């Protein structure tokens, strides 16, 4: 069964195989006095591994590199932060330390720099205007417009029909907004319907935090964000 939050110390990283060559990584952090899940993706790319997002901080992420090798034994050579928050770039430092080439939209690097969060080295051109999509190794990267953050990207694995929406998508257990400090609440339902239009194929849908679902995660997220909008 996919892991739930209370099973994972603030330091233990679980790997959850989602298909041949596709895993998710699951870590936990403390924030607001409380303890939260966080998902990221691992995609095999021939001989190497593409990482999507950090494990939320340098400790967790050095740890996350150590499951992968222990459990998968393939080198992580590239990594993508899907937006500028710490649960995504927390431990880019680390990854670069180990030789991982880090990447991020130019929108994400600038807002990370403005924010005092770590900065991916490379820039992921071709993702600026809403609807922009580019190909990155075994997956597709999509910029659905402002939502959870103005920079958020979302990731699609054709090979297994996995759609990783990160923090732009909520799990079903999550009924209420939670951190929208950097959200474009007006655009978020829209930015999201695109994700629906441009990836109807997706059987597995991972959110930034919590239990994967199918595409009803999207409609649930819109419901949450709209509810939130009206107070």
Ligand X SMILES: NCCOc1ccc(-c2cn(-c3cccc(C(=O)O)c3C(=O)O)nn2)cc1
**145 versus 208: smaller Cβ distance to Zn ion:** 208
Per-residue tokens: 133: 């999509």
Q: How far apart are the C-alpha atoms of 169 and 212, rounded to whole Å?
A: 10
The answer to whether residue 198 is catalytic is no
Phi, psi dihedral angles at 10 (to 5 degrees): -80, 70
Q: Is 122 labelled as part of a ligand binding site?
A: yes
Residue 174 binds to Zn ion (criterion: CB under 5 A): no
Residue 36: contacted member of Zn ion, ligand X, none (CB under 5 to 8 Å, by partner type)? ligand X
Q: Which of 137, 140, 135 is nearest to 154 (CA)?
A: 140
Q: Where are the beta strands (DSSP E) in 46-172?
A: 48-52, 76-80, 101-104, 122-123, 133-136, 139-142, 154-157, 162-166
Minimum Å distance from CB 17 to ligand X? 23
Residue 178: contacted member of Zn ion, ligand X, none (CB under 5 to 8 Å, by partner type)? ligand X
Which residue stretches of the chain are H helix?
A: 58-71, 86-89, 92-97, 106-115, 188-198, 216-229
The answer to whether residue 148 is catalytic is yes
The answer to whether residue 85 is catalytic is yes
Q: Is 118 labelled as part of a ligand binding site?
A: no
Applying CB under 5 A, which of residues 26, 167, 195, 218 lies at the interface with Zn ion?
Answer: 167
Look up residue 203 and give its DSSP letter. S
**161 versus 179: smaller Cβ distance to ligand X:** 179
- Applying CB under 6 A, the residues found at the interface with ligand X are 31, 36, 85-87, 115, 167, 178-179, 181, 208-209
User: Which residues on adjacent β-strands are paired with residue 51?
Assistant: 42, 79
Q: Is 83 labelled as part of a ligand binding site?
A: yes
Contact partners, residue 81, CB within 8 Å, separation at least 6? 53, 54, 88, 89, 92, 102, 103, 104, 108, 112, 120
Q: Is 3 labelled as part of a ligand binding site?
A: no
Applying CB under 5 A, which of residues 85, 109, 194, 220 lies at the interface with Zn ion?
Answer: 85
**114 versus 231: smaller Cβ distance to ligand X:** 114
Minimum Å distance from CB 116 to ligand X? 8
Applying CB under 5 A, which of residues 22, 61, 79, 87 lies at the interface with Zn ion?
Answer: 87
**54 versus 102: smaller Cβ distance to ligand X:** 54
Are β-strands 22-31 and 34-45 bridged in parallel, bridged antiparallel, or unpaired? antiparallel
The residues carrying an active-site annotation are 83, 85, 87, 148, 179
Annotation: binding site for Mg(2+): 12, 138, 171
Which residues of the shown chain bind Zn ion in the complex (CB under 5 A)?
85, 87, 167, 208
């Amino acid at each position: 069964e996919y892991p739930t939050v209370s099973e994972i110390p603030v330091g233990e990283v679980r790997l959850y195989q989602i298909a041949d060559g596709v895993w998710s990584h699951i870590a936990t952090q403390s924030f607001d006095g409380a303890v939260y899940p966080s998902n990221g993706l691992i995609v095999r790319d021939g001989d190497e591994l593409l990482l999507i997002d950090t494990a939320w901080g340098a400790k967790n992420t050095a740890a996350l590199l150590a499951e992968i090798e222990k459990q998968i034994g393939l080198p992580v050579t590239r990594a993508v932060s899907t937006h500028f928050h710490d649960d995504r770039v927390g431990g880019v430092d680390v990854l670069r330390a180990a030789g991982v080439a880090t990447y991020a939209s130019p929108s994400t690097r600038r807002l990370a720099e403005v924010e005092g969060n770590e900065i991916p080295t490379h820039s992921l051109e071709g993702l600026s205007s809403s609807g922009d999509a580019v190909r990155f190794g075994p997956v597709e990267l999509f910029y659905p417009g402002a939502a959870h953050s103005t920079d958020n990207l979302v990731v699609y694995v054709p090979s297994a029909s996995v759609l990783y929406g990160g923090c732009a998508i909520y799990e079903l257990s999550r009924t209420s907004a939670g951190n929208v400090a950097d959200a474009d609440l007006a655009e978020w339902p829209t930015s999201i319907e695109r994700i629906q239009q441009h990836y109807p194929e997706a059987q597995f849908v991972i959110p930034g935090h919590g239990l994967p679902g199918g595409l009803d995660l999207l409609k649930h997220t819109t419901n949450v964000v709209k509810a939130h909008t009206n107070r």
